[PDB]
Amino acid sequence: GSSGSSGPKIHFNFELLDIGKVFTGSAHCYEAILYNKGSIDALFNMTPPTSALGACFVFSPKEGIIEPSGVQAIQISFSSIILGNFEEEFLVNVNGSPEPVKLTIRGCVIGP
Numbered sequence: 001g002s003s004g005s006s007g008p009k010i011h012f013n014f015e016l017l018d019i020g021k022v023f024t025g026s027a028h029c030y031e032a033i034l035y036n037k038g039s040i041d042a043l044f045n046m047t048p049p050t051s052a053l054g055a056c057f058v059f060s061p062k063e064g065i066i067e068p069s070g071v072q073a074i075q076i077s078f079s080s081i082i083l084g085n086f087e088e089e090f091l092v093n094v095n096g097s098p099e100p101v102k103l104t105i106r107g108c109v110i111g112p
Helices: 052-056
Strands: 010-012 016-023 028-036 042-046 058-060 063-066 073-078 084-090 092-094 103-110
Touching (some): 016 028, 052 084
Antiparallel strands (some): 028 073, 042 063, 042 092, 058 073
């Protein structure tokens, strides 16, 4: 909608995902469902982070399509040795949509 800046058609089951504390040097298993509020096929894509703690994360599928009036499971994997809290932000490139689906993930890495 040219006028009245609107948002994307797809939306995550939640706004922010808290993973709490996580042991160092260990793989984390997480998921994220994405509902496509589009009439027809909706092209989506995940953009790589810039920070270090952000890269560690692995979102998939790196790209694809979310059928209309449905959902799409997102495989998330985080693993890093860098201790201490960290705050990153991921975006989802969508063809047409004015702005991507920003997703903030908060977590804390600790060790022995």
